Design a protein around this nucleic acid. Structure first.
Lengths: 200, 990, 202
DNA sequence: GTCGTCTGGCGAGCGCGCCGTTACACCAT
RNA sequence: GCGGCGCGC
DNA sequence: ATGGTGTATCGTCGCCAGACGAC
């Protein structure tokens, strides 16, 4: 019953037990990032892009479709797809543009990634709560979530299990990042590790 | 079934509009078809049978009887009553009447069943009786001449024949009152009244009169087009019925075509510029059609003349120069003399109502056209509709609304109509109201009336008040009649000043709004390039605020304009305010715009039409009332109030002589306008030759401090609690508001001894005014949310620091009121907790809380969840305030009924009693006597016994019923306070 | 210049002159409607879907995907799909749930209807402003567009052609809209004719 | 499927009246 | 029916 | 004189009615 209050769709636990590969995606105001993991908790991929022209004052489905298609072109196939589910409220009369951005992003990603949904009605994309990520790792203060740059420095610069071939690229990416809130995109990797810990 | 309801409504409307052959043809067509003979019930058959019966037509009634026999049904008492009524109209042989009476006697039906169980008119009953007298001339009905009399303990001396009778009389003669009745009848026969506005008139220029002329010719063309469209629609619907189909033709023929086109033109005139939803317009049109049919049926039925004769006979009791053989209450006099009573209205089904509204709206949209160009060039002769359908956004939904043409809106705006419109039920009556005799008969002439204003429910409220014995409501009804028989008049001296300030730059601090020309303009305009990042973003913030302020000012001026226009209409007339009640028992006047349950301006414009000499002590009571309205001395005894009135007499005279020129001492009080009225009254009384022979029309008010805590302290007989609410005699009045304020202040100082900033901010910023409303409404069921809203509203009018989210002030108010309960008001806490727990346990067993007042009025709570389950949150959080409201309504009704017997003019604001200045002492004695007599009965024990008998009676759920019985039989023990001391308390009501 | 304001994705004019079919879609807060044309102003199909689980308080995208997929499953194939475009803006905070619902439906329709977008890079779903359609059909009074039920009734009872076997059911469907008015059903046909008059066949 | 314990969303004392449902900002023959 | 206000207890 | 267009504040709380586990 715990997973029903953490995952929004009513996915079956028997399918979550038999998983092989997950993509974790986190998008924000300015950039997106994603990570590809296997069942052995191996980091096959971790890539961030910031070539967005989505939010420049005008909202249009054509440019959103173009940018999302270009991004999803550079993603390997995986068994399950997960993305952030920040719980902003309609009742608050502020932060409406970012909420609209989040909903349009979730809509096109849900349709664009859930291939072969018309033939067989199986949901291959899921949402998991940000509070579950901030509570399982216990890096979040009350009614907020603090940054986790110290935690990813603790992993690098056994649970993450970075590969030997691409360890230098990950180290260079970590060392060359000093701004633009890269940890606010590394929450994708944190959420993927939390998903492996909680759903198995 | 929907179709059965539509057919039954069709046949009933046919018998209402005398379109009997049409209904007969449709009935024959439906009866012929095998697939249409089903879904036909006996109500349709005997409705058509009664319609045939009303005007001769023996052969057609016999054929309808043949249809009923062929249908396989069994005729009932109403069918036989219709058969006996036709036979009476045209005299028929004895054998036939008998060949029918024996048949009715057979098969179980009774000879006298139709006379009692079947409800028929007086003419039908007389015709049936004349038809039976042909066979049996010795038949007669029981007279039942003596009416029942209430014999409860609290209402025993009200209805006692023995004793001194001093019922008051009006100051107007019989002929004047008859003319007033005729004027009210002529006003109410029309469904709408036009009033000259108070806005300053603009001189009509050339373009204004041109717009008025083109409006006149457009309205004439629209009237002709609407008449032609209505005739075409009626012909089409009649042709549809002749093909054996249901239509709205009888409903469309309910009124004359002139009335329908006038109603359509009036609703077109009142349609908003932005528009209104189509369904709301349809419902409004259907409701107006039903109300107009109800009003205008009484002209042709003949009830208007009978009502006129009985009213002329009944007003000998209220006339100054007329007398009755024995004085009695107005309701008892109306119950005698054979006066008619209004019958309950049968509402239409919702589908036919909505369909009629939509048909009328479509007629209005299609039939109205106007030239496309308002200019004098008439090129191409283009004609466009005035109203269009626009699919727009309302709330968070999509709604189709009706929108006018902008040219029509511009034409209406250019030709400023100086006339406002009102409904006949929204204006005060021009004649004395009818006595209240039933929940469905009273108040306005020739109009449906409801005793209870509860929109929610309305089928369970009206079922408990019509199941109980008729005597139990009597003490309520008389109390509603007595409040209705109060003659009112408009104080023109105050009205001149109010209209002088209104037709100028208004004075918002005195309660009169300002015109929109003085709206706060923006400080500056925008710029192309922002000098600072803060710029170009705060302009919207400080401009939408100005727009909101302008909108609020517009709303305030609109309501003030309506109120002052209605007040100026009744300047030289005497009017009456009929009264209704809610489900709790609280009484409200029926005219909403202008009544005494209003602001300072509304209360100062109202005076008693009848006046009384001041007497030995009238002037002192007038001066004490003036000091009370001034508000400077609320913690002082009465003798010091009188001395203060003596000291400031020069300011009183200056305010009376020069209200707006010299010194303005009347400004600066809580109620400046009533203070000015009292100043004028006192100035007239002092300057008279005999100050005791001066006739005063000004009402004097006596009020309780907290009438909720005043009842809580007496149900628990709490000793030290009753001291604070002036139930125990003392030379100095006790203010509960100032004690709560002092406790919160000292504990705020204690909290500010520690480290907190909100407590230090609130140093010296907390007074009686900021906590008075909250403390008054704690006993009425307020939560911390509403209390915080009230405290924020009160602190947004001071020089407080911008920390207006005070969640601590409401916490301290509730906490130290509870501490005051722990010290001295423990009975209040115990009784409130017991009532809340009992209500919760009743709600958990799927029931709504029902009780009876000590006066006999049944009260039910209508809160249910969206047959339906009760809303436990609203059910358990409202029981103690509703009980207190029932108790204080009962006390007010008892005081009114015992003040009427002594010749007093009594009118009631909630907890506030108003009477003449010469009758203050008598009213105070009656109020104290009835408060002691009301609480000398075991109210809580009777409530517990009722709740153990009504609820906790079924043994199906024994486990919950056990706990219900232990909680319900756990009445808190009373204290050691003596109730009789309330008779010797001077500040119980002041 | 006019086509820039009329049509937002800005498809080059040669593709707009060789079309063979069109599907016009108008959706609201309670129902969706669509119409089909085949370059001869011949109505191949005309349908509406009313029963929804949307706009009930929960903006769950899973039921959005299921409902949109179920609607698209009945939609036939066509050269282009024109969608309505309301004039709501982000400034109106009171009508924000309506704007959110419209934007989610528009994004999902853009993603799912454009089946072969990634392989070619060409757009197949268009957005048309309804104010321009109202100006074209003279349904504009002030700044508000009025209904076109009577104009559709004039059509059904040269401008538009109805197949002989498909007329009467359509008329019955129109007779099902007398009690409650379905504006999307008329708006879809009006937008289809406006597309065949202002962009195609111009 | 059914019904017993648990948790997460709901709503705020009544009565009456008014208004509104859809920013205004920069510009030039 | 929703929102913004105002008044009375 | 007008039409041409334009788009990134909440702050409580308690409690009870639907939702999921045991049969």
């Amino acid at each position: 019953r715990f997973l029903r209050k953490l995952l929004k769709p009513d996915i079956e636990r028997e399918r979550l037990k038999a998983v092989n590969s997950i993509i974790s995606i986190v998008f924000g105001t300015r950039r997106i990032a994603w990570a590809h993991l296997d069942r052995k908790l191996t980091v096959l991929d971790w890539q961030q892009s910031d070539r967005w022209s989505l939010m420049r004052g005008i909202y249009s489905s054509s440019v959103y479709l173009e940018e999302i298609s270009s991004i999803i072109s550079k993603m390997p196939k995986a068994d399950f797809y997960v993305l952030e589910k920040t719980g902003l409220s309609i009742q608050n009369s502020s932060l409406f543009p970012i909420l609209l951005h989040f909903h349009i992003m979730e809509a096109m990603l849900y349709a664009l990634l859930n291939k072969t949904f018309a033939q067989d009605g199986q949901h291959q994309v899921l949402s998991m709560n940000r509070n579950a990520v901030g509570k399982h790792f216990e890096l979040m203060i009350g009614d907020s979530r603090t940054s986790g740059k110290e935690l990813v420095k603790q992993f690098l610069f056994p649970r993450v299990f970075f590969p030997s071939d691409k360890i230098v690229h990950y180290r260079q990416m970590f060392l060359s990042t000093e701004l633009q809130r890269v940890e606010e995109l590394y929450d994708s990797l944190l959420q993927a590790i939390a998903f492996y810990e909680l759903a198995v | 079934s929907g179709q059965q309801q539509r057919l039954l409504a069709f046949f009933k409307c046919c018998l209402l509009t005398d379109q009997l052959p049409l209904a007969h043809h449709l009935l024959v067509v439906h009866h012929g078809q095998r697939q249409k003979r089903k879904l036909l019930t006996l109500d349709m058959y005997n409705a058509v049978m009664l319609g045939w019966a009303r005007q001769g037509a023996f052969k057609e009634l016999v054929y309808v009887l043949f249809m009923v026999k062929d249908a396989g049904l069994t005729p009932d008492l109403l069918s036989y009553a219709a058969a006996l009524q036709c036979m009476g109209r045209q005299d028929q042989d004895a054998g036939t009447i008998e060949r029918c009476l024996e048949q009715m006697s057979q098969e179980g039906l009774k000879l006298q069943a139709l006379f009692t169980a079947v409800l028929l008119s007086e003419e039908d009953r007389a015709t049936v009786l004349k038809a039976v007298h042909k066979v049996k001339p010795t038949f007669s009905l029981p007279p039942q001449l003596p009416p029942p009399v209430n014999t409860s303990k609290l209402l025993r001396d009200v209805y006692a024949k023995d004793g001194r009778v001093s019922y008051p009389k009006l100051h107007l003669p019989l002929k004047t009152l008859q003319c007033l009745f005729e004027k009210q009848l002529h006003m109410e026969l029309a469904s709408r009244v036009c009033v000259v506005s108070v806005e300053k008139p603009t001189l009509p220029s050339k373009e204004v009169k041109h717009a008025r002329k083109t409006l006149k010719t457009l309205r004439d063309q629209w009237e002709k087009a609407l008449c032609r469209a209505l005739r075409e629609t009626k012909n089409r619907l009649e042709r549809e019925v002749y093909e054996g189909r249901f239509s709205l033709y009888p409903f469309l023929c309910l009124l004359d075509e002139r009335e329908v086109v006038r109603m359509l033109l009036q609703v077109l005139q009142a349609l908003p510029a932005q528009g209104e939803s189509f369904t709301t317009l349809a419902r409004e049109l259907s409701a107006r059609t039903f109300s107009r049919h109800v009003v205008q049926r009484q002209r042709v039925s003949g009830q208007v003349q009978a009502l006129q004769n009985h009213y002329r006979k009944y007003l000998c009791l209220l006339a100054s120069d007329a007398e009755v053989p024995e004085p009695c209450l107005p309701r008892q006099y109306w119950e005698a003399l054979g006066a008619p009573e209004a019958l309950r209205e049968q509402p239409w089904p919702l589908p036919v109502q909505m369909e009629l509204g939509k048909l009328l709206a479509e007629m209005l949209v299609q039939a109205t056209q106007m030239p496309c160009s308002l200019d004098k060039p008439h090129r191409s002769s283009r004609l466009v509709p005035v109203l269009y359908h626009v699919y727009s956004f309302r709330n968070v939904q999509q709604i189709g609304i009706l929108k006018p043409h902008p040219a029509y809106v511009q034409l209406l705006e250019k030709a400023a109509e100086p006339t406002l419109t009102f409904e006949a039920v929204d204006v005060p009556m021009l004649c004395p109201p009818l006595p209240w005799t039933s929940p469905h008969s009273g108040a306005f002439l020739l109009s449906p009336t409801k005793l209870m204003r509860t929109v929610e429910g309305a089928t369970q409220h009206q079922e408990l008040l019509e199941t109980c014995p008729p005597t139990a409501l009597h003490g309520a009804l008389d109390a509603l009649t007595q409040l209705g028989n109060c003659a009112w008049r408009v104080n023109g001296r105050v009205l001149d000043l109010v209209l002088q300030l209104f037709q100028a730059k208004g004075c918002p601090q005195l309660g009169v709004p300002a015109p929109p020309s003085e709206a706060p303009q923006p400080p500056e305009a925008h710029l192309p390039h922002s000098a600072a990042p803060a710029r170009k973003a705060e302009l919207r913030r400080e401009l939408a605020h100005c727009q909101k302020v302008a909108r609020e000012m517009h709303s305030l001026r609109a309501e003030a304009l309506y109120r002052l226009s209605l007040a100026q209409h009744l300047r030289d007339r005497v009017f009456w305010l009929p009264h209704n009640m809610d489900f709790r028992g609280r009484t409200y006047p029926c005219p909403p715009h202008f009544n005494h349950l209003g602001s300072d301006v509304a209360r100062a414009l109202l005076e008693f039409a009848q006046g009384r000499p001041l007497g030995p002590h009238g002037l002192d009571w007038l001066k004490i009332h003036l000091v009370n309205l001034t508000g400077l001395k609320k913690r002082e005894p009465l003798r010091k109030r009188l001395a203060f009135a003596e000291e400031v007499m020069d300011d009183i005279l200056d305010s009376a002589d020069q209200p707006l020129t010299g010194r303005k001492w009347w400004m600066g009080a809580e109620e400046p306008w009533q203070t000015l009225a009292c100043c004028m009254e006192v100035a007239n009384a002092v300057r008279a030759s005999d100050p005791a022979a001066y006739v005063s029309h000004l009402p004097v008010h006596q009020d309780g401090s907290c009438n909720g805590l005043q009842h809580y302290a007496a149900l628990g007989r709490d000793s030290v609690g009753a001291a604070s609410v002036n139930l125990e005699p003392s030379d100095v009045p006790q203010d509960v508001y100032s004690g709560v304020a002092a406790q919160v202040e000292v504990f705020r100082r204690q909290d500010a001894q520690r480290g907190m900033r909100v407590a230090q901010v609130l140093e010296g910023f907390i007074t009686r005014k900021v906590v008075k409303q909250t403390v008054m409404t704690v006993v009425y069921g307020v939560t911390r949310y509403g209390g915080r809203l009230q405290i924020e509203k009160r602190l947004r009018e001071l020089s407080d620091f911008p920390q207006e989210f005070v969640w601590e002030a409401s916490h301290y108010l509730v906490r130290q009121v509870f501490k005051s309960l722990q010290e001295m008001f423990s009975g209040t806490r115990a009784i409130q907790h017991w009532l809340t727990e009992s209500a919760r346990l009743i709600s958990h067993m799927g029931s709504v809380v029902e009780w009876v007042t000590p006066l006999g009025v049944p009260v039910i709570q209508p809160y249910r969840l969206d047959s339906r389950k009760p809303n436990t949150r609203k059910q358990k959080n409202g029981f103690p305030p509703n009980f207190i409201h029932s108790l204080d309504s009962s006390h007010m009704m008892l005081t009114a009924l015992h003040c009427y017997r002594k010749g007093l003019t009594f009118v009631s604001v909630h907890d506030c009693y108003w009477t003449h200045a010469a009758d203050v002492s008598v009213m105070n004695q009656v109020c104290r006597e009835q408060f002691v007599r009301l609480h000398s009965e075991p109210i809580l024990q009777d409530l517990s016994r009722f709740l153990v008998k009504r609820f906790c009676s079924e043994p199906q759920k024994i486990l919950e019923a056990s706990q219900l019985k232990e909680t319900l039989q756990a009445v808190p023990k009373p204290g050691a306070f003596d109730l009789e001391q309330v008779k010797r308390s001077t500040y119980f009501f002041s």
